[PDB]
RNA sequence: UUAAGUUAUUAAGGGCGCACGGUGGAUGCCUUGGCACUAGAAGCCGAUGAAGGACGUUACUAACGACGAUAUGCUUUGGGG
């Protein structure tokens, strides 16, 4: 899954890990009221953003590197 | 039949033996854990925030381990299938 977010664009990121935060939270919501049936999604979504975060940050190391 | 004499039978419960049960966790067998040592590395951290902890994190959850708001884990190189 990593492969196409170093081709993302470095608020394509941004918005992405906002998008799926809604996604997560709907997810607990529909949860807490028993209507949800597919628990796996909130585990690979919390991974998903664990990605973006990590190729993130090594984006801000590089730059300081270069720096 | 009358006298005189002898001598039983009962087990309320108890004793000994035998048989059959229960309780209890010794004995034998075993090892997941320990004791003493040999050889060879190393001898230990910390303001770039330590040793130790507290709170949290699994879809469901108490304890212990692992982890830390990127949370029962993330990326990458190399093995494995």
Same mark, same amino acid.
């Given at each position: $899954?990593?492969?196409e977010? #170093?081709?993302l664009t470095? +608020? &394509?990121? *941004? !918005?992405?890990? $906002? +998008? +799926?935060k &809604?996604?997560?939270? =709907?997810? #607990?919501?529909?949860?807490?009221?028993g209507?949800?049936?597919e628990t796996?999604?909130?585990? %690979?979504?919390?991974? %998903?953003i664990?990605?973006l $975060? %990590?190729?993130?940050? !090594?984006? *801000?190391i *590089?730059?300081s $590197?270069? =720096?």
């Amino acid at each position: $899954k990593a492969k196409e977010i #170093r081709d993302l664009t470095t +608020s &394509e990121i *941004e !918005e992405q890990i $906002k +998008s +799926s935060k &809604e996604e997560l939270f =709907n997810l #607990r919501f529909q949860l807490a009221t028993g209507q949800l049936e597919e628990t796996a999604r909130i585990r %690979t979504v919390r991974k %998903t953003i664990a990605r973006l $975060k %990590t190729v993130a940050r !090594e984006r *801000e190391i *590089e730059q300081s $590197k270069a =720096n």
